Amino acid sequence: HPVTIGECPKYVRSTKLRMVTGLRNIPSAIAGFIEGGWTGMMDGWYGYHHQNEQGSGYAADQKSTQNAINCITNKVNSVIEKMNTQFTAVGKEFNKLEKRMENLNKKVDDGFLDIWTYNAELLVLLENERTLDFHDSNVKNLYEKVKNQLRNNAKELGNGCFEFYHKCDNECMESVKNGTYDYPKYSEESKLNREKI
Amino acid sequence: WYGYHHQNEQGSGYAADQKSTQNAINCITNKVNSVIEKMNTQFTAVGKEFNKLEKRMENLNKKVDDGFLDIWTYNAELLVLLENERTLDFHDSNVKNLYEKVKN
Amino acid sequence: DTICIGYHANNSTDTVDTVCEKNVTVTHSVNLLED
Amino acid sequence: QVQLQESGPGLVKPSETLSLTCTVSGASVSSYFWSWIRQPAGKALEWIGRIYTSGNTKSNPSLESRVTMSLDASKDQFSLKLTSVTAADTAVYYCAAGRLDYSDTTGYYKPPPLDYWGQGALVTVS
Amino acid sequence: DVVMTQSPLSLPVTLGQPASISCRSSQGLAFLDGNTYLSWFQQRPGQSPRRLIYKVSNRDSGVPDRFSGSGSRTDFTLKISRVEAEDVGVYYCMQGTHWPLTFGGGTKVEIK
Amino acid sequence: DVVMTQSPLSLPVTLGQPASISCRSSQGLAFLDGNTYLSWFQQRPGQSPRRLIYKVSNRDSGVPDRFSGSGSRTDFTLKISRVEAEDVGVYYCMQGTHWPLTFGGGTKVEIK
Ligand SMILES: *[C@@H]1O[C@H](CO)[C@@H](O)[C@H](O)[C@H]1NC(C)=O
Ligand SMILES: *[C@@H]1O[C@H](CO)[C@@H](O)[C@H](O)[C@H]1NC(C)=O
Ligand SMILES: *[C@@H]1O[C@H](CO)[C@@H](O)[C@H](O)[C@H]1NC(C)=O
């Protein structure tokens, strides 16, 4: 109802206003972002999956998830503090010979509501698309970083996955996970297995 | 809108990618219907008359009528200018994805 | 010896609206409307 | 009943390493976030850092270089290791536990809740 | 970090009178899950701290009904309707949204 | 798909009186070329359907002038100024913008 007393939210004639804070839900031989997402990861939004001789497991990237969560939190607080909301109106009454004032008051009251409704819907439908594009960009940066670290040691299958030519154990997987993967110690066996094939 | 051109021994010819063009046409149609329905228009006013001793309400009515028009003009021009740039960047992104797919 | 890069999904049925597409399923969402 | 008890040395010399252990009884260690909080005499509380069972320690930016935490499920013990101690480190130390939900993805990326506190141990540096 | 400001430092009240403590934040404390995460803690003299209010309005089990907290955006308030002899001590406000976890300055309650 | 609703199902009218049929769609029918693409068809009993109205306002060749259609956004209307004996049958509305092609339920016109 438009008539409010106290500290009250702003009145809009909208039925649904929902804002994205997460990813797109695309469910589903574990493959990368081209096939879809993984249900079995509950540590973070973005991450890795390793399958080797010792075992198979999932892991999450903490830094990218934390930066994304910080930007989405700032987005939420920007939406909340942008529209300061306070006592708006109580309504006025007019007699039978002040019809022009009554129509002017209705014109003002019905002209502000349209502007505020239009502004709220535009804000939601722009910020949702910005959030989704930001998530896709972050996944692309992780893929580029892992590719740039591995170079010629591993082959691309497409589908966001890499197959190691050499033998890569758990410390080898954690080396490319945390950003410190030294090239030369695994280069020779990878050269042999690449040239033999 | 997007597609391939091939030259080989048997002949030469153009083609078109019919899924990417379909998706682009489907997003641009959604932008058209968002522009139309989102800023809905209706009957607004008929005008009012005041005599020689109600100058203040005449100025207030003129102030309201001239303050809403500037806001709506600014909103319409800003919406058109943003959506055009989004459309152009979307087209260039689609062409880059087709090139990356053929490369891969 | 395979490493892959992907993201997180669950069983949520929350839907939002964008400029290209309507009824897009998302993992998490916040309601800003009180009714 | 979840009961937490602290034990450690009262006196440490300067430039040494201070160690405290927070023995937990009544509940498993895997179901809680574990945090350390220090308080100087007649001053404000200060948060040091937190740890969960799989293993990550997020500590306060100021005390990041000199802190190290660990947890053992066999003896149900939570440990602190503070290196290069100074006379400004004279404080009462508390260990706190908060609830962990494995389905909640975002809960790893905010400060943990503080539900069950501990008795506290006094450490002076002289 | 994020700065908490409490008012007043000392609030002497008589038995059977209401009291109010105010906490203010430099930043908004809303999280992306839809919550605020501000807590109110009590410390008796020579004892460990215990919690009174978890989140803006929710009250912990075992806490008396005279403790009520409310607030929004950047200002929050804890109110005690009746003050007894077990209400002595120092009260703090804490935020758990942004890294690192920051505590308030502290408000001391004395009986007149 | 796109759901099209027609009103009413049966519209009995007397000779020389106007009639109106309403068609409503779930989505907007505007295209990126600047047109709407909605069509109105007539079906006589035991005969193939034939086209009366193509687009919102344009009228097909050979169609009498008494058939006039107009509308916008989501609501559209076909009007007959004078109803004759050759105006019996079932009338339909289609959209030609979105995949797939959808037809209406159908409105039957009987003479009283
Ligand atoms: C990355 O992980 C390895 C263990 O595989 C460890 O030795 C190294 O110190 C880590 N790097 C960083 C920067 O923490
Ligand atoms: C997803 O599954 C869990 C299983 O415990 C259930 O609790 C939750 O309600 C489900 N989500 C939805 C949206 O139904
Ligand atoms: C979106 O979903 C709602 C809920 O099922 C439905 O009512 C609406 O028609 C849908 N819109 C589109 C364009 O599919």
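qc> The interface with chain D takes residues 1, 31-33, 37, 39, 48-51, 54, 92, 94-106 of chain E (CB under 8 Å).
qc> done
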